[PDB]
Amino acid sequence: QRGLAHLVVSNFRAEHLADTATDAYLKVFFGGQEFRTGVVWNNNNPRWTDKMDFENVLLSTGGPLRVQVWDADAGADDDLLGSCDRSPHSGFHEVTCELNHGRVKFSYHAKCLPHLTGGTCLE
């Protein structure tokens, strides 16, 4: 069907998230699917190696790509450091989400399924 794209979110990293110990991990959502990175313990500028392949998704209706930045805080209650919503479109795109402290950056690739074109793969 029209509007389908293979969506892969990757290249996650954050900077200046805080002497303050930061134990960050991400929660990434799209079309109801949730992925969680591992915790990078004790680092204000973490990098995660994860690729999050959402497989074939409806770009224009799969709600926004939502990224949440959480701090595990040595295992104690998790703190929400910030979140952002992006509307993905076909191609390769880099995202920067500013938080209360620092920012999270990532990339995504949305490749329209064969015989489809346009920003939301409807053509």
UniProtKB/Swiss-Prot annotation:
It comes from the Eukaryota. Disruption phenotype: Mice are viable and fertile, but die of virus infections that are normally efficiently dealt with by the immune system. They cannot eliminate lymphocytic choriomeningitis virus, but die of the infection. Young mice are abnormally susceptible to mouse hepatitis virus. Cytolytic activity towards tumor cells and transplants is also severely reduced. Residues 1-101 form the C2 domain. Ca(2+) 2 binds at residues 20-21, 23, 42, 55. Ca(2+) 4 binds at residues 73, 77, 79. Disulfide bonds join 84-97, 112-121. N-glycosylated. The glycosylation sites are facing the interior of the pore. Ca(2+) 1 binds at residues 71, 73, 79. It is found in: Cytolytic granule; Secreted; Cell membrane; Endosome lumen. Changing residue 71 to N: Abolished binding of the weakest calcium-binding site, leading to impaired interaction with lipid membranes. Perforin consists of three domains: (1) the MACPF domain, which includes the central machinery of pore formation, (2) the EGF-like domain, which forms a 'shelf-like' assembly connecting the MACPF and C2 domains, and (3) the C2 domain, which mediates calcium-dependent binding to lipid membranes. Monomer, as soluble protein. Homooligomer; homooligomerizes to form a pore-forming ring. Pore-forming protein that plays a key role in granzyme-mediated programmed cell death, and in defense against virus-infected or neoplastic cells. Can insert into the membrane of target cells in its calcium-bound form, oligomerize and form large pores. Promotes cytolysis and apoptosis of target cells by mediating the passage and uptake of cytotoxic granzymes. Facilitates the delivery of cationic cargo protein, while anionic or neural proteins are not delivered efficiently. Perforin pores allow the release of mature caspase-7 (CASP7) into the extracellular milieu. This is Perforin-1. The lineage of its organism: Eukaryota, Metazoa, Chordata, Craniata, Vertebrata. The chain holds residues 410 to 535 of 554 of the full protein.
